[PDB]
């Protein structure tokens, strides 16, 4: 399965999705800079509308514990 095919379900907790992401990211062998680009970009983009909304409110500069606690009720 390709990294672009990794997406969050409509009922799937973000948490279970983030695990899937760094597992697939774990099978990507690209430069770190590209993998940083993938992190800030693709993760949020394939996140579900309800959490996506939430993550837009965190702004930039956000870290994984704060994202992970931010989308917990969703």
């Amino acid at each position: 399965t390709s990294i672009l095919d990794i997406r969050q379900g409509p009922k799937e907790p973000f948490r279970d999705y983030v695990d899937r992401f760094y597992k697939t990211l774990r099978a990507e062998q690209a430069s770190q800079e590209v993998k940083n680009w993938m992190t800030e970009t693709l993760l949020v983009q394939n996140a579900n509308p309800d959490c996506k909304t939430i993550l837009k409110a965190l702004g930039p500069g956000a870290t994984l514990e704060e994202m992970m606690t931010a989308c917990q009720g969703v």
Binding site: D19, F21, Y22, L25, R26, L64, E65, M68, T69
Partner: protein
């Protein structure tokens, strides 16, 4: 790891498969539970950075945590480089080079280099510096993964 031989010198010996598997099994069974940290600490006795990356790289699962740890290891490493600047002028022929954050993380150093630093007199405890970063990052994880 680097262990003491019968002759009375410190030499490197490889870590054992049922040690490896015991590390695997702990992680399988107790995931993020606190008992993992003393457990780690015992199984990391006399261990190299190289052996510590081996242990971290051989994890399966919990990839969000594994990434958080990585990023903590690099932060703690960035901090090592900040706090300890490089030293004045060229490296002496009679001496061996001071480590950076990435040598402590095992990345830029070779095994023989890791054995030079630890076995030499004075010895430098690059294992114990990485160990605190691992334990610190383990606290971060434990605190987050509390529900």
């Amino acid at each position: 790891p680097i262990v003491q031989n019968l002759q009375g010198q410190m030499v490197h010996q490889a870590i054992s498969p049922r040690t490896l598997n015991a590390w695997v099994k702990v992680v399988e069974e107790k995931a993020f539970s606190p008992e993992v940290i003393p457990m780690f600490s015992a199984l990391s006795e006399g261990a190299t950075p190289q052996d510590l990356n081996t242990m971290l790289n051989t994890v399966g699962g919990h990839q969000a945590a594994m990434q958080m740890l990585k990023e903590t290891i690099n932060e703690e490493a960035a901090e090592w480089d900040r706090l300890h600047p490089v030293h004045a002028g060229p490296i002496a022929p009679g001496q061996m080079r001071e480590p950076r954050g990435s040598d402590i993380a095992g990345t830029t150093s070779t095994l023989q280099e890791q054995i030079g630093w630890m076995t030499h007199n004075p010895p430098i405890p690059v294992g114990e510096i990485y160990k605190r970063w691992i334990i610190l990052g383990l606290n971060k994880i434990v605190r987050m993964y509390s529900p």
